[PDB]
Amino acid sequence: QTIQPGTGYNNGYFYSYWNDGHGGVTYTNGPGGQFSVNWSNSGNFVGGKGWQPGTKNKVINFSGSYNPNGNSYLSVYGWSRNPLIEYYIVENFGTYNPSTGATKLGEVTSDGSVYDIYRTQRVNQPSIIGTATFYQYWSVRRNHRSSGSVNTANHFNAWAQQGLTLGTMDYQIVAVEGYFSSGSASITVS
């Protein structure tokens, strides 16, 4: 159904839905690993389905539609602990490339497209363990798409060769993010 921000399990999948309380967002958990999100002049939000904990060799499949109107992105999103890292494998985005201002650390070919790799640091920002300073790792697909298969191992191995290590895996989901924009998406994970 439609639900307020929170986390839990639905039809076998882990889900996490968060928003800054601005409103204008509607997140709905559907059958299996499906979820829909409709947003209109929203605040900041992130929602998706996946696993808790994720793994370093998972092959993630997603399919559906993604129609952003503004700042937003579709990605495999998750965290690792010890070290604390937030990572993204961006498959599509709207008006803003989220890696802008980031330090390019390489490139990796995987699942039909080249990806550019970047690293950035977040200072005193919210995280799964409280306020902290941690790094964000990004893999941004050059050929955008709204369905496909993601071999996470290829990204995690490429990041490691570049000195970008990961700790113990926390959740790992396919999510839709929005930052003061509008759009709609319906994605099925598996």
Side-chain angles (χ1 to χ4, degrees), residues 30-45:
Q34 190 275 338
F35 71 96
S36 303
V37 195
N38 297 79
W39 70 105
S40 178
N41 302 316
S42 63
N44 189 203
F45 72 91

Side-chain angles (χ1 to χ4, degrees), residues 139-175:
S139 254
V140 183
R141 198 179 174 89
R142 287 190 187 163
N143 300 328
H144 305 181
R145 55 182 189 165
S146 308
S147 297
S149 178
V150 178
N151 192 332
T152 66
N154 295 334
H155 296 276
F156 302 148
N157 291 336
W159 299 346
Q161 302 175 185
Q162 298 303 112
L164 303 185
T165 174
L166 286 174
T168 301
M169 299 301 258
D170 201 89
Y171 68 70
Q172 183 180 65
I173 64 173
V174 171

Side-chain angles (χ1 to χ4, degrees), residues 93-163:
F93 58 77
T95 51
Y96 177 60
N97 182 323
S99 59
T100 302
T103 304
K104 178 165 176 182
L105 272 269
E107 310 176 338
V108 59
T109 305
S110 184
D111 309 299
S113 178
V114 170
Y115 286 71
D116 289 297
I117 301 168
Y118 310 82
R119 175 192 50 54
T120 56
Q121 178 177 70
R122 292 285 282 174
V123 177
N124 286 300
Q125 299 304 305
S127 81
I128 50 167
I129 54 76
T131 301
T133 286
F134 48 96
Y135 291 113
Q136 291 179 308
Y137 298 158
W138 304 80
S139 254
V140 183
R141 198 179 174 89
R142 287 190 187 163
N143 300 328
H144 305 181
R145 55 182 189 165
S146 308
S147 297
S149 178
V150 178
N151 192 332
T152 66
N154 295 334
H155 296 276
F156 302 148
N157 291 336
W159 299 346
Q161 302 175 185
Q162 298 303 112

Side-chain angles (χ1 to χ4, degrees), residues 45-95:
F45 72 91
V46 193
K49 275 183 170 174
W51 304 263
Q52 171 65 290
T55 75
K56 298 189 182 179
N57 68 319
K58 190 183 301 298
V59 171
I60 300 173
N61 309 307
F62 62 98
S63 73
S65 70
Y66 170 63
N67 300 98
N69 192 323
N71 198 343
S72 157
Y73 56 91
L74 174 67
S75 65
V76 163
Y77 166 60
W79 298 76
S80 100
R81 290 169 185 263
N82 197 45
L84 177 70
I85 294 295
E86 179 177 45
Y87 64 79
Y88 303 79
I89 299 170
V90 185
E91 298 292 289
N92 206 335
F93 58 77
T95 51

